[PDB]
């Protein structure tokens, strides 16, 4: 099996030469799959230099142009449909249905972007309010901020890149992109893309697969305006300390809840969903289900439906059309997940079903009454695990989807109309999914998190927003002759 | 002896030799002010102040328009009791009601006063395709011009205050028809902008008009916009011989509401249910006028709304008391009882009321009244209340919307789908949820569907439709 | 020559059969070059009852099928462009470069609908204003008015349609559409288009070129919301007195005035941009530069410039790829133009150059200082005629462009700040033209004016808007448990 | 004798055994006021109440929060000749200046009350895609809970009214630290809030704090947002140290200003120059410290500015025609006297001014000031203009983007392209078109780039940074 050789993008050139490699192992085989240049320090200079020179023909750019980008990565995606999904599932170890699915979804987020470049509105303003501001009125519009600095995860290798590359490209920003050591191939794929379109000024875009050694420059150098950050929780918060004086956004992990206080439509549906949210990514998802609160009523009967078919569930090689479950990122993750699940019972919760590893794969796993003390019930699992917990006072349901230190997003069943809106009122999250599971995320929704689950949203339109700076043009008598 | 009244023309109190308008204690029956009526030559001239004070409105700055609505506030504050006496004295509304219409008005004026200063426009990039390059626009706002207004008898204050308040946060000059049954109040609101220095001459008039000469507010080309608030088959007519001009109309409704839950609970659900099918007396294009009721809940909601409805007082408006005062006339009071021995003999049970005392008419519940009764398929405009009982939810919503009417529909439910099912089903304006159809925020888009009219009032809906759009489409602006 | 046959569609299906056949003329040749069924009075009330039974339909259809049914149509029109243009000059007249241009724009229109379709926003307002409301909030949304009348006219029959229909598609109305006898098919291909997509129910839509004995239908029908017209001023201001209770959006003609206070960025520009403004589509178009205000201090440069750009204008076969000015709609339309230019020279206006008929065929013509009471400076005169005249007060410049009953747009070529917000706040028009002739339209701007030019505005989003009711929901204490 | 304040503690005035705080006549230098030092323990107690009044801020309606700011604009008026006094007396500030300053701060106050009622939501399709079918949103704005504001010495209770009136029309609960040496004004908008009854117990705290304790409302995790104001090297250090909450920062400036034209006239634009370069004595972060004359009008403008600036009135700030004040301690005057010498050292030239007189600075124009000395290359934050000559109006632009700040810029042109290239060019939060830099409307975004700071405050923009998103995602709502 000969690994195959790709380029990394600089100043928007694919660059390979005598640079160190990058291995990039298929993670159900365990083999090399793939090999990347590593960029240098000078490399990352060289970005930051030309991301900075290409920012004034960034925003010289026509609506329709920053437009015609991202429709040329629309048609493309889907031009490479397959292939991009085979090298996704490959990387990530995500199932080929849910690749195809991220794909899918990746192609929504270029198209969503491809609108909102023709879309960006200003206001003219009164400013005539009191008789000492006579003759006084503005024009505020918006501005590219500049040269952005992106740090993308491995769980969505593709989407997640998207969500900050779309919306620079649809602002007029330029940027310089780290995407993940581990699945760094989807991010050059789009790097392909973009170094055959002659809309895209020269040196708008770098992606770069980095060493340790020369990460930091992403976080601390001066010469970027805004910093977007997708991972680890301690990873993100210590860049945002060390960030100097940049703009930084945050999409960071999750312990999202489900209140279960009735059936919608019906059981049958509400397991589905269930199913969906604690173990679709193998719950390697920021919005995974990790937590999941039935009432009492109700308890036994979705108990016994959501075990049995949680027990269906089919784990084994990604590469095969009718596996729901894939293996984790490393055996490393499911060592870890393992470890969390033996504490938990050790503790005193009780396993339903699963809590084995075999290699990197951890089965599908139910544990009811997991205590607040234990790592799996106070800190985000990312794995096929869930905890089942019973309730019998709904504010009391609430009170607990809240203690919690993350705050991305909650799920609620429900067919009670102030049910659904206390709900909405006083869950501490970014959003709330009113009869679906929390793992529901919309490309176009408002997306991101309160307390440790990071600060500002994506969402083509809101990360469009923190790319973007207010300039207001305040007017004494313009129109008097 | 009656209090003589002075009408606004051109901004100015005029009287002169015109011939007089007897105003009516719609309790007593006593002449209580004389109004004098404006001529055709006063309209003329009228509609020529409008025109000539358009320029002058459309360049005062946005914190004037906001300071003549802010004494405005302050002017209706200082004469509060007195505007309530005299709303109650000439429309019939119970004290209480009065006084509950001039905090409205007061939050009517409050609310174009903070509007006045937030006219926002746009800036638009207009180069979307490859031969818009370097097009960029500023869309802006402008004052459509001259307003033509026709108010009715039933809010004589708040339903003037609706049309008159966006006219003055925009910048548009008008003219005013009130109504000649109740003119005080649209008459006190020109005392009130006449004394104002900051409000362009000509910006206003106020004249009570002949029935030979009321077509002018209609068919004039002067006019920009003509407003109707009143009896829909006058403002269909109105809107067909209007011309050129935009019309918006406010006209009336046929308001039914389900009750397929109480909502926190029956005492609650009870009273806004008394609220919606009484209060103003049913004279209200809001009114509450069919009530539909789930099987499982109706002998103890009929139960309960009947006896609520026994313990109403009516009588002297005047009186603190007084939850029900009188129709605006007798003759609309015995309209509203041959309404009511019709719709009983058709078939309808009545449950209470029914009875007609001059221009009283009793708190009425009528039961099944048949679709061919005129009490079903017309706006009764009284204190009359059609019962129904429904088995299957969406059938109701059905039967909610089997009206040629489409004004506000009210639901009360603890159902997140049935609330949100009815959001997206009834044929209206506005959907009242957990409270009756009878429920207006003054800042709301209020209006209907079908023979309820055309456009929204509330403040900022209302500025809208006196609101122009205008682009300023630029070609490289800002090339050196 | 073999006329070609086309088909009608009724309740979105293709029929000819017994029916009459409406003759459509090659506008250069003068042959009968297509033949379309004749629908009759029983036909119509049919297609009126096919968009009322299909109006719920229409409503349930989610905001991604709508954006799919106007997707299917970019990509039809963009793989018949060709056909399409060649069309378009035939019934039309209009040179061939124009009628590409008029494709280009409805591709753009039925883009904006598309993007526009997926965005219909709707408020969460809080209604606690004062404390007599307390424990209110409203959700306002917007649904569809439900059936469409539409009529449409002979001088841009591709693109004024798409004004109309685009918008219906993308807010969810079904529509009867009348297109003008003269040029139907233009409005029959995108009947042939739509009739293909599966996504748009059955009786969404009919298209019927109609006879003067049941045009009435398409004003007084009560089963029609909206009245949507773009044509003569005179048939239209009738048809809005006659409509019954419907709405009604009118797009009626113009006599459109440009100031030239400077040379904007330069002479020879400016001089094209007019030539543009005056006799592109050969003046058949509601925003036609009728009238040119020029500063005494430029007048000679830029009438010398003008005269002499306009003589060299390839007047002839629409179908040559140079010509620039075609034949007018019929020989009656320029004999009308004509006589008007006579009337103008008899009033005492004096000919700089054309002012000759040969058959359909006008001169392009520029004729000085014609007097008010003339029929060419009062009225839209819809030919290639431009009415010259000086000024030496900019503010009477102004003045002198508002002198009309007519307000659809302006132009204005000025360096000077004051001057050009002076314009946009005292022309009286629907949009002002800021170094450019107040013939150019963005398919995405408010379009429409004041005075005899009509009521509301189209442009894509501002048609939705009046193709859209207000509904609120008032709620009260929602979220209390 | 000193006047004695008190500091508010959860709402509640608090004086005991503190450690006692001199605020000083900045004229004068006589002990004014002692102010009450809060503790490390009334701070946590400060934190532990806003945390505690976040669902109590949270509940209330928007016209309890509307009622509260209309309370505070009732109060500034009724106080204003107080308000200002005290204001010339901690600040220096002209009391001309102190006026309207309290006029800027009623405004400010009045438009967030307007705002107050004016949070709105979006209702959103989200079936943007088949695989996204039956879904919709419902977009709210919630406070984003308890906020550290730190506020400065210059405009010390408009400043303050721009951190605390959004806080109040949005519901979020919050701690004040004022600057120590201008207390007063902050203590003053803490009384009024004292006696408003709508306010939930512990909404509010007021507390002057020693550098011992000062980093508390950096780096505190109960916070989640930390609004500055002031010094740009204090500003960034804060944002390094803040931790997970969200950082809002009003820094420093160097604003420049290009004359392309006189507009309307020469008299106009001297005057908008000189109300630029000395308005607050420079004492302002929008201050006009540089001044770019094309070469066409730079004689005419030298000539015409010296003469106006020799005519400007420096003296005792509570006179009616002191146009100039002392600066807010002899230290800064001797700071910028330093720069002033090493600006002409390094070849300026002095045109007027440039002399010390205690706290006094003159006021000073220095003609072609190299870009290595300190007067051009930082913050001068005094009564000093650089007077620079241009040929090239791109340049100009340039030159004035020339700079580490990018707060504000202004442009006097009669040109529509040299207004919009200005606007697309210049590296400010905010371009000024025919006026100064120094000018600021308080319901416009004001805020800059670079060194000036992150985001922006004006009302309306300053809540967006206090509101977080929360979206309800919808699936089949309505489908019985």
Not at 445 to 468: C, F, H, N, T
């Amino acid at each position: 099996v000969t690994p195959k050789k790709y380029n990394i993008f600089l100043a928007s050139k694919p660059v390979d030469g005598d640079r160190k490699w990058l291995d990039v192992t298929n993670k159900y085989t365990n083999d090399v799959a793939a090999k990347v240049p590593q960029a240098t320090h000078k490399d990352i200079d060289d970005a930051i230099d030309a991301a900075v020179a290409a920012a004034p023909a960034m925003a010289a750019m026509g609506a329709y142009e920053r437009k015609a980008v991202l429709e040329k990565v629309v048609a493309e995606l889907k031009n490479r449909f397959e292939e991009i999904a085979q090298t996704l599932t490959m990387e990530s170890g995500k199932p080929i249905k849910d690749a195809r699915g991220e794909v899918t979804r990746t192609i929504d987020t270029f198209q969503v972007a491809a609108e909102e470049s023709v879309r960006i509105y200003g206001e003219h303003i009164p400013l005539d309010i009191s008789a000492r501001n006579k003759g006084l009125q503005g024009i505020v519009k918006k501005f590219p901020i500049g040269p952005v600095s992106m740090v993308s995860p491995w769980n969505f290798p593709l989407n997640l890149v998207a969500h900050k590359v779309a919306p620079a490209i649809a602002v007029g920003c330029p940027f310089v992109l780290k995407p993940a050591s581990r699945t760094p191939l989807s991010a050059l794929i789009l790097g392909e893309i973009l170094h055959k379109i002659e809309e895209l000024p020269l040196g708008a875009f770098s992606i770069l697969p980095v060493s340790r050694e020369d990460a930091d420059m992403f976080t601390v150098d001066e010469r970027f305006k805004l910093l977007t950050f997708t991972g680890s929780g301690p990873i993100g918060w210590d860049m945002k300390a060390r960030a100097g004086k940049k703009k930084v956004v945050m999409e960071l992990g999750g312990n999202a809840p489900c209140i279960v206080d009735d059936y919608v439509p019906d059981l049958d549906y509400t397991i589905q969903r269930l199913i969906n949210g604690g173990f679709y990514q193998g719950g390697q998802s920021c919005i995974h289900m990790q937590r999941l609160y039935v009432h009492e009523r109700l308890y036994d009967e979705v108990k016994e439906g959501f075990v049995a078919a949680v027990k269906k569930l089919k784990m084994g090689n990604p590469f095969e059309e009718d596996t729901y479950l894939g293996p984790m990122i490393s055996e490393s993750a499911a060592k870890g997940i393992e470890d969390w699940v033996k504490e938990a019972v050790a503790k005193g919760g009780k396993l339903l079903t699963g809590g084995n590893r075999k290699g990197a794969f951890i089965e599908p796993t139910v544990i009811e009454d997991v205590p607040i003390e234990a790592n799996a019930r106070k800190e985000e699992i990312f794995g096929p695990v869930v905890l089942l917990y019973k309730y019998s006072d709904f504010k009391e349901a609430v009170k607990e989807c809240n203690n919690t230190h993350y705050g991305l997003q909650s799920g609620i069943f429900t067919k009670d109309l102030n049910k659904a809106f206390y709900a909405f009122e006083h869950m501490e999250v970014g959003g709330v999914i009113l009869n679906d599971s929390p793992a529901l995320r919309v490309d176009s929704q408002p997306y991101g998190g309160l307390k440790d689950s990071g600060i500002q949203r994506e969402g083509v339109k809101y990360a469009m927003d923190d790319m973007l700076e207010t300039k207001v043009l305040v007017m004494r008598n313009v129109g008097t002759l």
